[PDB]
Ligand binder design. Structure first.
Ligand code: HG
Ligand code: MG
Length: 307
């Protein structure tokens, strides 16, 4: 089957997350959502660097047309970070907008640009919990004149996002619902409607919780399963179709991104954070980064945020 390789040079992460593959520089960026640090990995040169800040972070995406600048989350703020990619702190930080100025215990979580370059991101309680905890998150996109628009609320744990190739569908994961939802996506108005379940974990005996996701060129979704020790491949052509399962040694798989020179290697982040309600003993929970080859599919390069 597919070959799953632990990336030794990268070490262990508390909650590694938000992988972004920059295809022109052949570079993987990612975050640790509890340790307040950004990470850069260049596989062809075996080069690893990091950057520390003093706010919780959850995504890092290159700014379109601005080498050396990134759009990031800092607690509840969307900001532009200027970073040379090697120094241990940012050169400067430019705040764009605070998405929830008066919800003091919320944070931004997963964020991703749609194929047109619009940033989408969701919030959640800092003390959110599974299976039950405070439900306080919403789904936003960053639109004209640096103002956000709200598209969904009552989100427990805002997580992975993806869009179909023809720009008619959006896929979204609230981990607390243990399902992947699909929406009709209107690219001209950037609005979503007709929410319905695409894939429900309970119907297929899939353990754990859906976390990050990414779509391949054939339109299949690859979904990280937190507390599932796996990634799964699900159809977008028909509801409730499990196409394949790939086991990952780390139980707490958090996200996925296609990368490599031909976009046919799947990079997989995980969490070493040891939780008190785990289905897995502490010795199993490490937080390594993995590379999966031999999946027989290609993905897309990560999209830069347009501002
Ligand atoms: Hg950074
Ligand atoms: Mg996530």
């Amino acid at each position: 089957g597919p070959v799953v390789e632990k990336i030794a040079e990268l070490g262990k992460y508390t909650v590694g997350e938000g992988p972004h593959w920059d295809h022109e520089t052949q570079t993987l960026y990612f975050v640790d959502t509890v340790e307040k640090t950004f990470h850069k990995y260049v596989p062809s040169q075996k080069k690893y660097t990091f950057c520390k800040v003093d706010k919780l972070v959850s995504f890092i995406i290159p700014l379109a047309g601005s080498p050396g600048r990134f759009v990031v989350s800092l607690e509840r703020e969307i900001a532009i970070l200027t970073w040379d990619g090697v120094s241990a702190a940012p050169t400067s930080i430019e705040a764009i907008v605070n998405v929830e100025p008066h919800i003091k215990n919320n944070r931004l979580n997963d964020g991703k640009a749609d194929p047109l370059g619009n940033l989408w991101t969701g919030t959640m309680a800092i003390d959110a919990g599974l299976p039950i905890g405070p439900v306080t998150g919403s789904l936003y996109h960053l639109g004209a004149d640096k103002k956000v628009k709200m598209h969904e609320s009552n989100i427990a744990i805002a997580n992975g996002l993806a869009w179909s190739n023809d720009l008619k569908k959006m896929y979204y994961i609230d981990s607390g619902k243990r399902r992947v939802d699909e929406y009709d996506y209107d690219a001209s108005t950037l609005s979503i409607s007709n929410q319905r379940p695409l894939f429900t974990f309970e119907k297929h005996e899939v353990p754990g919780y859906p976390d990050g996701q990414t779509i391949d060129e054939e339109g299949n979704l690859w979904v990280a399963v937190f507390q599932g020790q796996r990634i799964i491949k699900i159809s977008t052509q028909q509801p409730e179709v499990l196409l394949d399962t790939v086991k990952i040694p780390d139980p707490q798989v958090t996200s996925v991104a296609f990368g490599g020179p031909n976009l046919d290697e799947l990079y997989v982040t995980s969490a070493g954070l040891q939780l008190d309600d785990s289905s897995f003993d502490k010795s199993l929970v490490n937080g390594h980064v993995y590379r999966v080859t031999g999946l027989g599919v290609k993905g897309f390069a990560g999209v830069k945020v347009k501002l």
